[PDB]
Structures are given as structure tokens and as C-alpha cells.
Amino acid sequence: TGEAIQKLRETENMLIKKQEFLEAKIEDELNIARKNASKNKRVALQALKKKKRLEKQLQQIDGTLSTIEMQREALESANTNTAVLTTMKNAADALKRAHQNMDVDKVHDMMD
């Protein structure tokens, strides 16, 4: 049902924690590199190597997140149309009754 939007959030919301988790570990690795940049090339390079891979995990979480967002915004659209189109036709039904009754009044005059 529309509850699908509920699972799209919470999913999206969990995905932001992953996103904030990576951003966290990225600056973490970065600060390791900073403090070992000149004193310890080995450790510094392991950091930048971990950082570069974390950043990659962040891109495809970003791309995935926006993908999630749009499907939520596609459900929202289709969810409103569901209401709009039912009242839209309900109206055209009522309107057709008006036009129908009119046509029956004319035929009722032919009864003379």
C-alpha cells in the first residue's frame, strides 16, 4: 500500500547513517595520515589507501540514496493521483447524471 513509502523512508533513513558513518571514518583515516605524513610514510599511506576506498563506498551510497528518494517521490505522486483521479471521475459521473436527467426531461415532453 502507501505504507511502501514508510519502508522507503527508514530504509533511506538507515542509509544516511551509513553515509554519516563513512564520512566519519574518512576524516578519521585522514587525521591518521596527517599525524604520520612525515614521521611514518607507511602508516600514512595505509590511511590514504583506506580513505580512497571509503570514498568509493560513499559515492555508491549517494547514488543509491538518491535512487531511493526518487522512488519515494514517485510513490507520493502516484499516491495523490489515486485520490485526484477517483474524485476526478466521481465528478464526471455526477456531471453525466446531470446531462442524463436533462435528456430524460426532453423525452418526457414527447409523451404528449
Side-chain angles (χ1 to χ4, degrees):
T1 93
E3 263 176 329
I5 298 173
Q6 190 76 303
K7 255 202 177 194
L8 265 63
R9 278 188 273 186
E10 119 182 342
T11 284
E12 134 182 341
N13 178 22
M14 154 275 196
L15 207 48
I16 299 174
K17 280 200 72 174
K18 300 294 187 184
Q19 171 170 296
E20 286 168 352
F21 168 73
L22 290 171
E23 294 165 341
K25 266 303 216 292
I26 282 173
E27 260 277 324
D28 281 32
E29 297 304 312
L30 181 47
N31 285 334
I32 294 170
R34 293 193 225 255
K35 298 173 180 181
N36 293 261
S38 53
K39 176 231 173 197
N40 199 323
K41 300 301 202 303
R42 179 173 183 282
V43 165
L45 249 167
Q46 292 196 341
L48 296 183
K49 202 154 283 168
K50 236 178 287 183
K51 173 178 180 285
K52 183 163 174 175
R53 258 151 44 209
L54 289 165
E55 286 170 342
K56 188 76 181 305
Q57 298 201 109
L58 189 58
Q59 298 180 1
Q60 53 197 239
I61 268 181
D62 293 331
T64 297
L65 181 58
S66 66
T67 292
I68 293 289
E69 283 163 7
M70 295 176 214
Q71 292 301 315
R72 166 170 144 269
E73 294 153 32
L75 278 250
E76 289 166 5
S77 292
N79 189 85
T80 56
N81 290 267
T82 303
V84 150
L85 249 172
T86 48
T87 64
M88 194 70 69
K89 146 169 178 190
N90 169 287
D93 277 345
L95 191 96
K96 193 220 268 182
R97 255 284 183 87
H99 294 10
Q100 268 174 352
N101 290 330
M102 269 163 37
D103 294 337
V104 181
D105 289 335
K106 302 200 75 62
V107 176
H108 175 51
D109 295 339
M110 305 193 75
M111 303 226 307
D112 296 341

